[PDB]
Design an enzyme around this catalytic site. Structure first.
Site, PDB file in Angstrom:
ATOM      1  N   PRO A  63       3.439  -2.784   3.573  1.00  0.00           N
ATOM      2  CA  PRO A  63       2.711  -1.258   3.605  1.00  0.00           C
ATOM      3  C   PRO A  63       3.909  -0.475   3.310  1.00  0.00           C
ATOM      4  O   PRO A  63       4.838  -0.551   3.980  1.00  0.00           O
ATOM      5  CB  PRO A  63       2.305  -1.351   4.942  1.00  0.00           C
ATOM      6  N   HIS A  64       3.556   0.877   2.881  1.00  0.00           N
ATOM      7  CA  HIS A  64       4.542   1.642   2.309  1.00  0.00           C
ATOM      8  C   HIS A  64       4.105   3.135   2.315  1.00  0.00           C
ATOM      9  O   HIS A  64       2.996   3.370   2.292  1.00  0.00           O
ATOM     10  CB  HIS A  64       4.984   1.375   1.025  1.00  0.00           C
ATOM     11  N   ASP A  65       5.030   3.987   2.445  1.00  0.00           N
ATOM     12  CA  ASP A  65       4.902   5.235   2.200  1.00  0.00           C
ATOM     13  C   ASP A  65       3.679   6.323   2.809  1.00  0.00           C
ATOM     14  O   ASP A  65       2.544   6.447   2.017  1.00  0.00           O
ATOM     15  CB  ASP A  65       4.590   5.536   0.367  1.00  0.00           C
ATOM     16  N   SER A 114       1.500   5.472   4.998  1.00  0.00           N
ATOM     17  CA  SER A 114       0.260   4.920   5.319  1.00  0.00           C
ATOM     18  C   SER A 114       0.266   4.833   6.821  1.00  0.00           C
ATOM     19  O   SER A 114       1.218   5.003   7.396  1.00  0.00           O
ATOM     20  CB  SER A 114       0.343   3.401   4.757  1.00  0.00           C
ATOM     21  N   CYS A 160       0.804  -1.141  -0.029  1.00  0.00           N
ATOM     22  CA  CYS A 160       0.016   0.092   0.025  1.00  0.00           C
ATOM     23  C   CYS A 160       0.951   1.360  -0.013  1.00  0.00           C
ATOM     24  O   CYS A 160       1.830   1.367   0.238  1.00  0.00           O
ATOM     25  CB  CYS A 160      -1.020   0.006   1.356  1.00  0.00           C
TER      26      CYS A 160
END
Length: 424
Positions: free
Chosen positions: A250-252, A254, A227
């Site tokens: 999960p990424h960036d 979130s 994500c």
């Protein structure tokens, strides 16, 4: 002294609750139309001059099956879409030979009446949603028509079908199996939840996407889950097995993510679970992450304010838990056992709290803290700034039977230890 963490209640995250999430109230509209007319496709493909690879797959001007203006289930699509683009090959088993786009006003459901939706690898099928999408009690698989089976992973750059949702979308996946999706291409990693690109987002200002993925199973995916700028996403009770690069990634920026009661193992190249680049204020609890090629659980690139609790993290080929430049996190009551390298490793991170953790029988240290100068590496210092300091507080728990000793903390700014059991 500190009380045990308050963890989000998971009792409402069930398939019966997921089924009640959508309006099956108003019938939607199905069309087969040109792919490049739509933002949902342009946003990751690019302009007209990038369409050639899609022309080759479809052997013509690229089209998509589109849902908008209300509710459409997979059985409705089959009735309305020509057999050459969406075909029932046997009862409840369907092959899609075009991408499916759920537009902003669209509501798309797949349920138990579907035994399997096969997305054609050769025709370039995939699923993109800007609307509402509900998938329960079924299978959705990347399918090679030439092999007559799953599009088993072979190489990073070979296209494989995938699922992608955009800003403002809501997505619920329950009791579902997916396999063999994703490849090394932006937004095409497997199952990807994503805000629009910065330029498009500032115009559309849709709000961050959200949703649930519960009691499901993902195998042979490039990334099991990805994500970007996603809020409040629930990943609960799933099995992530034998995925290629990451299990759950999960990424960036979130935030508020709930990653719980998953079993993640067999990841072929990297980490079971990794949150990276300001994934903040999230919860990683009661997972099993084991037998992954690198670490069981990673917090990376200034991911802060997180709670990592009561996880069984074992038999990973590098560390149990690794913190990379990610301070102000709580690790509570994790059982980190028999990982080949360190139980818990903390690099360049300050204000790490290690409460009631058990680190036993790891190949190297139970707990290892260190600093490292990341300048003149491949790291983007502007995007991912760092500071070469390490500090932690350890309370309770146990460090024992580790190959290289209970703990090592090299050049700490400060370490405080209270009532830690270290068996000799």
């Amino acid at each position: 002294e500190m009380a045990k963490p308050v963890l989000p209640d998971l009792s409402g995250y069930t398939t019966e609750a997921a089924l009640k999430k959508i309006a099956r109230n108003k019938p939607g509209k199905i069309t087969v139309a040109r792919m490049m007319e739509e933002t949902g496709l342009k946003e990751f493909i690019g302009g007209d001059n990038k369409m050639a690879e899609w022309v080759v797959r479809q052997k013509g001007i690229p089209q998509a099956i589109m849902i908008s203006d209300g509710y459409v289930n997979l059985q409705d699509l089959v009735k309305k879409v020509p057999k050459q683009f969406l075909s029932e090959v046997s009862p409840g088993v369907y092959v899609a030979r075009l991408p499916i786009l759920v537009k902003e006003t669209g509501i798309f459901e797949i349920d138990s009446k579907t035994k399997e939706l096969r997305l054609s690898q050769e025709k370039g099928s995939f699923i993109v949603s800007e609307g509402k999408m509900l998938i329960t009690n079924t299978s959705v698989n990347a399918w090679s028509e030439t092999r007559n089976g799953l599009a088993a992973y072979r190489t990073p750059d070979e296209f494989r079908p995938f699922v992608l949702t955009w800003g403002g979308s809501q997505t619920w996946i329950a009791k579902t199996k997916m396999a063999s999706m994703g490849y090394n291409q932006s937004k095409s990693y497997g199952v990807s939840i994503s805000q629009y690109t910065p330029n498009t987002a500032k115009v559309l200002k849709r709000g961050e996407p959200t949703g649930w993925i519960i009691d499901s199973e993902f195998a042979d995916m490039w990334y099991g889950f990805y994500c970007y700028e996603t809020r409040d996403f629930v990943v609960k009770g799933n099995t992530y097995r034998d995925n290629i690069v990451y299990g759950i990634d999960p990424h960036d920026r979130s935030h508020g993510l709930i990653i719980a009661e998953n079993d993640v193992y067999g990841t072929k190249k990297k980490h079971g679970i990794i949150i990276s680049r300001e994934v903040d204020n999230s919860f990683i609890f009661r997972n099993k992450s084991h037998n992954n090629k690198l670490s069981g659980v990673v917090l990376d690139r200034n991911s802060v304010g997180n709670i990592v609790a009561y996880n069984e993290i074992y038999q990973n080929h590098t560390d149990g838990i690794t913190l990379y430049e990610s301070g102000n996190n709580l690790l509570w009551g994790n059982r980190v056992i028999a990982n080949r390298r360190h139980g818990i490793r903390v690099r360049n991170s300050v204000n790490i709290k290690l409460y009631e953790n058990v680190a036993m029988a790891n190949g190297l240290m139970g707990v290892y803290g260190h600093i490292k100068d990341l300048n003149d590496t491949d790291r983007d210092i502007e995007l991912d700034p760092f500071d070469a300091q390490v500090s932690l507080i350890m309370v309770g728990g146990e460090l024992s039977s580790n190959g290289s000793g209970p703990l090592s903390i090299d050049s700490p700014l400060s370490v405080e230890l209270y009532r830690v059991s270290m068996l000799m």
